Homo-oligomer: 94 residues x 4
């Protein structure tokens, strides 16, 4: 029940690690939820059209779709930006 090799004691500071993977992932979603349902749309009805990458072919057929993922890598970073500042200040505790 206590100290051998299969069971060290209680699941130690593996606690924060697990929390890392479990809450980081959870965080990941909120981040995107915002960008896919708010951000992307906004940028779409204002500053310009949404996307452009259904672009290629090349004596074979690669894709500019590559770029698209980057372009968003770019706007996906952004949402975090706007997230941190809007949240760092308006931190209400209920």
């Amino acid at each position: 029940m206590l100290k051998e090799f299969k069971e060290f004691a209680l699941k130690g500071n593996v606690l924060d690690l697990a929390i890392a993977v479990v809450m980081g992932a959870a965080f990941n979603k909120i981040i995107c939820s915002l960008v896919e349902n708010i951000i992307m749309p906004l940028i779409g009805k204002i500053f310009g059209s949404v996307d452009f990458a259904k672009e290629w072919s090349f004596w074979g057929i690669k894709y500019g779709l590559f770029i698209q993922s980057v372009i968003d890598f770019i706007i996906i970073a952004f949402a975090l930006f706007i997230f941190v500042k809007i949240a760092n200040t308006l931190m209400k505790k209920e």
Copy 2:
């Protein structure tokens, strides 16, 4: 077969790292399995209705769906809570 640059020796303490990504992810699922099949439902037949976020439109159409992901970020954290305490004590070894 031994020491150059492409092969250092044996796959060293990359061991725990791999285990991190492989078992953290695995953990992630159990966490959710609980929340999606037990927790969420419970909170649904008792303390109140499940969700509310199919809410928006805005001279364009963003979404409160944003919130939903957060609201769950909130309840997804919770399941971990109840998980740790119910498990930290009832730690049986078969």
Copy 3:
């Protein structure tokens, strides 16, 4: 082109970090590929039947499906086990 705040220099030892997320994830899949196409099946035609969790209902309807995810958390750990030992020794370099 060099040292301000937006661009530090070259994408530094963020290199290993990126490699972590990019190759750990990649690893994650191989791990599972094995368990879903080899391991799980094996354990299914020999030591016994595959799974059991389509089990519940409870004056509401939660699920033992919860367990299933754990049971596999258990066998998903295993595949890593058998993976490391079978690979640590049979390390051929082509």
Copy 4:
């Protein structure tokens, strides 16, 4: 509003951690986008055919599909390779 146990102050250097999970994942996609839409195809119209793993059966029916995931683990590593070098030098700032 300040220092108790539920709220430490402001969401501290959990900042980089979150950024890790949020941008590493984001990175992960671009990596693959390239390999699935450019790399894999290329290697397919030139150096040879794409894949081979729809291979097995074994007095039961396991799969070489196992290998496939590894083979790609191999080519998925590669794309990173070509990514870093093509990018480390052509680092333009707009």
